[PDB]
Design a protein around this ligand. Structure first.
Ligand code: AP5
Ligand code: MG
Ligand code: ZN
Length: 217
């Protein structure tokens, strides 16, 4: 159960990741989360990352590969893991292959969550996130039970700093450039599976379960 999720900004990676972790019991590894946590702490790594993240640009490959290698070296990853939003360049994918070869933990599937690009702006601009647990809601498509607060813990919802229209436009341009080469990389390795992310959340997850329920040790 060594799984990677890829998809354009807003496609539903984090929404699916939360459900995969709950169902299958493997740790969530999100480069986005790691960077934003480091930003909040204002560490040298965080202060370096912030410059890129704020513009909607990719953080350099070197630092990014480093933090993922470090995370994967932790004991919990022995049972599997769910990488969310990494790799997102071919150089990251190549380094990952080598790391996982050394570790003896090769990827089972790369799940590509496909959503029409024309949908992604509204996905992001309408997104609200729990400040306590980080789960995501959508004011139109997936609202909380009580406006402004999280169903699970009562935490206050907020809007991610990079979810403004101008930053979203950039984030979409940057990552769309990467789509064809990464798809070509993993289609080659015969681990790529496409899922239709343009469905109700539980229906996208139904399709994810078809794939992940098939895995046997
Ligand atoms: N490897 C790397 N290398 C270099 N730099 C890196 C890097 N990784 C990260 N970075 C940097 O860090 C930044 C942030 O990265 P990261 O945090 O990875 O952001 P991202 O990839 O842009 O993805 P998002 O979290 O924005 O969206 P998602 O697809 O997870 O959507 P969600 O499930 O919340 O859903 C979106 C919204 O839609 C709603 N929703 C979800 N599913 C559905 C559905 N099926 N139907 C309707 N609505 C839905 C949700 O409720 C929510 O409101 C990057 O821009 C970059 O600067
Ligand atoms: Mg996410
Ligand atoms: Zn919460």
């Amino acid at each position: 159960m060594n799984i990677v999720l890829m998809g354009l900004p807003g496609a539903g990676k984090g929404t699916q990741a939360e459900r995969i972790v709950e169902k299958y019991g493997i740790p969530h590894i999100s480069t986005g989360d790691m960077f934003r946590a480091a930003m909040k702490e204002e560490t040298p790594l965080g202060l370096e990352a912030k410059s890129y993240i704020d513009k909607g640009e990719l953080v350099p490959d070197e630092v990014t590969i480093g933090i993922v290698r470090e995370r994967l070296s932790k004991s919990d990853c022995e049972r599997g893991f769910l990488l969310d939003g990494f790799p997102r360049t071919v150089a990251q994918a190549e380094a990952l292959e080598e790391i996982l070869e050394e570790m003896g933990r090769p990827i089972d599937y790369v799940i590509n969550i496909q959503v029409d690009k024309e949908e992604l702006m509204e996905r992001l601009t309408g997104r609200r996130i729990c400040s306590v647990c980080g789960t995501t809601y959508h004011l139109v498509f997936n609202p909380p039970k009580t406006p402004g607060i999280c169903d699970k813990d009562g935490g206050e919802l907020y809007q991610r700093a990079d979810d403004n229209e101008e930053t979203v436009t950039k984030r979409l341009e940057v990552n769309m450039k990467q789509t064809a080469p990464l798809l070509a990389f993993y289609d080659s390795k015969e681990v790529l599976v496409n899922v239709n992310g343009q469905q109700d959340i539980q229906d996208v997850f139904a399709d994810v379960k078809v794939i992940l329920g098939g895995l046997k040790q």
